[PDB]
Every structure is written in structure tokens, then in C-alpha cells.
Amino acid sequence: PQITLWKRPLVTIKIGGQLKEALLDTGADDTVLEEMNLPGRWKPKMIGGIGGFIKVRQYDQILIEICGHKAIGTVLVGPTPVNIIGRNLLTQIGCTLNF
Amino acid sequence: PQITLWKRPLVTIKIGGQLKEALLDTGADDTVLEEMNLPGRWKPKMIGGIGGFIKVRQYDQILIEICGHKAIGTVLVGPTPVNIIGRNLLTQIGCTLNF
């Protein structure tokens, strides 16, 4: 689909078998989701945003379906203010900016 | 044009008579620019994201040119780590997400 930006580009995602809402975020290198339970191993990681750094849990090679498009990649889980889909997965679903 | 997301969507902007590099950021409601001493009145504001909040100065009705496309709107100035073009201006240049 084509998504305009008059509203926040929020979409429904499916991860770990559960539905959530997430923001398509071209300014994010990586994908960061609010605190949740995901199966499998994970490693601690740090990520920095506009206000500083936070501790996240890094889950690699995670299946995630974004607006009907499948991706398999890295998902960071931690105290982000909002579920954000970053470029690591936006590229997988073929997302581009156009103007 | 069409901008793929393999790398950060960085573009040249013109503001306050100066050229700068800025990120086309669909995850940003508003536009946040590096410290610059723009003329005119402003009001203080707090904006937050990953890692907490920072203090910025809000200027209204500021003209920005983004890849040759002109836009006019609110710009927040402060110690942001990167220049962020948000939806308030991205809409004005007809920017969409597409997949």
C-alpha cells in the first residue's frame, strides 16, 4: 500500500503469535518493541535515542509480519515509548520513501 | 524521487539561509534540528523519545527546503544528536511510504 503521513504511520504487526500496533519509523536503524515476552535466547544490548541510551533485550532472527508482509530479523525489546519498526525490517518488506 | 532504506534517508535541507543534512523520519511527529541561532520569537518545549526528554526551542512558521521541495512549519531547535525532518514537514512535500 501507499501510506501518507498526515497521521502517524501505525500498522498491525504479528510477533510471537501476538498482534500489536507499531510505528513505521524511517529514522530508526533498528526495531524496538515495548516490554513483552518472546521465546528463545537473547543478549543484552544498549541503544541510544533522542534522550539517551536504554537497556534492551536483543532477539535475532525473529519472525514478524508487518501489515501482511513477513520479515525475519532482529527485534529489540525494552522501555521504548512506542513500538517502532526500523529500517532493518522496513527493507525486508520492500518499503521506500517517495515524493 | 524514491529513497530506499538500506542506509539512513539523509538529505540536504536549507533553513535560516544555511545548508544542512537531515533525516527523513516518518517516526517523528515534528521536526527537530541541531542548535542554531534563528531570529524571531520562540517558546520552550520538552520533547521525548528513547532515552528520555530534551529541552528545545520551538520556532513557528519556519521555511525549510527539503531536496528542492519547500515547506513551512514548526521547527524545534536543541541538542538533538541528528537533524530530524518530521511528518509536519514531510506531508508538505508529498512524502509517502510505499511497499
Ligand SMILES: CCOP(=O)(COc1ccc(C[C@H](NC(=O)O[C@H]2CO[C@H]3OCC[C@H]32)[C@H](O)CN(CC(C)C)S(=O)(=O)c2ccc([C@H](C)O)cc2)cc1)OCC
Ligand atoms: C551520534 C548518533 O546519535 P545517537 O546514537 C541517537 O541518534 C538518533 C536519535 C533519534 C532518531 C529519530 C528516532 N529514532 C530512534 O530512536 O531510533 C533508535 C532505534 O534505532 C536506532 O537507530 C537510530 C537510534 C536508534 C525516531 O525516528 C523518531 N523518534 C520518535 C519515536 C521514538 C516514536 S524521536 O527522535 O525520539 C522524536 C520524538 C518527538 C519529536 C517531535 C516532538 O514530534 C521528533 C522526534 C534517530 C537517530 O546518540 C544516543 C544518545
